[PDB]
């Protein structure tokens, strides 16, 4: 009985107690109340209390994850408004804040940018449309946003390539960043 009361899942503890009751029915084959059936009734009441305490934690964890999903939805709505031609700020410090979102963080924008890029990559459209959508998101992004940070590596690498080539007096065999930036310019 005590080991059945030390399970992490109350639903397993309840079935263990039912099994123990079935075991006890074979040694006390009558209907009266004995001090051993009191053990099992008390154990079932304790398992109900444990179920209450367990639902606390489950609800709290679900709320914590749902706040993150809500923040991602709010950021998506803000970029959708900005892309359509409305004058709103896409900085994470300027997102509307609720009791269903909490305060926004930089990692929220990082996660949103990664998720959006993956979703655009998973679309069944020609590559030109994908490039157009990615460039729309790049244009709607704020100065220190995640979309501009991802492509800022390209610009930094291209500038370094050109400056190093000027210093050394020869272009290297590979300039991937300059080629990528030139294609994006095209």
């Amino acid at each position: 009985i005590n080991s059945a009361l030390n399970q992490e899942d109350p639903r397993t503890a309840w079935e263990m107690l039912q099994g123990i009751k079935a075991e006890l029915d074979k040694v006390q084959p009558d209907e009266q109340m004995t001090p051993q059936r009191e053990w099992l009734i008390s154990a079932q009441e304790q398992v109900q209390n444990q179920m209450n305490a367990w639902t606390k934690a489950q609800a709290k964890a679900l709320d914590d994850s749902m706040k993150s999903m809500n923040k991602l939805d709010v950021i998506d709505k803000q970029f959708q408004k900005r892309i359509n031609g409305e004058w709103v700020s896409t900085d994470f410090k300027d997102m509307p804040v609720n009791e269903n979102t909490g305060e926004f963080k930089h990692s929220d924008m990082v996660n949103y940018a990664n998720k959006k890029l993956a979703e655009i990559d998973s679309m069944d459209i020609p590559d030109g449309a994908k490039d157009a959508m990615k460039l729309k998101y790049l244009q709607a992004d704020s100065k220190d946003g995640a979309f501009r940070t991802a492509i800022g590596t390209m610009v930094t690498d291209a500038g370094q390539e050109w400056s190093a080539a000027v210093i050394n007096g020869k272009l290297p065999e590979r300039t991937p960043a300059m080629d990528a930036l030139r294609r994006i310019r095209n």
Binding site: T12, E15, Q18, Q28, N52, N70, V74, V88, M95, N98
Partner: protein
Amino acid sequence: MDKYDKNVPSDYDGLFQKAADANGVSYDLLRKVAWTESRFVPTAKSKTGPLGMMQFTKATAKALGLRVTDGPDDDRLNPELAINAAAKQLAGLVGKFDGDELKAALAYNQGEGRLGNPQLEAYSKGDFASISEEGRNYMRNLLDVAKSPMAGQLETFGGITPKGKGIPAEVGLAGIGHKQKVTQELPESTSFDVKG
């Protein structure tokens, strides 16, 4: 989620009748199994979290003989073929257990092998003590909609007295829960629109 909502306006059930008639499975059993596995929830998040109505696993999905290696990393995401495969498996299980035994077929929950064969043997002997807690609870949840010769022996297992009935966890722990304080009501932004 209480009492499985038998007579609730049936949401997205335009598939269970056809699979039941095609394979022979009872409509009530298939609907109840789907509700137990996923509660008709479109997200169905868990350790694996198959959002399909039949919350399978990768091993079972591949062993079902489908083309699971397709689409979004798993082909059993479109409801109709997954439900049809589950119905075919359920019909094969029910038929192979000598008649309309609608509860030994709940080897569907435990499988056949190193962890499922002894439990099925114990069920055949009527010795519910050798069946796992998960299996016993899963069969207890299906007592309302099932036709079995041992449906009465399972309910009178675990009573406080030999003339009593065991209490399923869905009834003993029913009503105990806490509401979520976070809702999907998002804050709205307004554009600075001055048309001069």
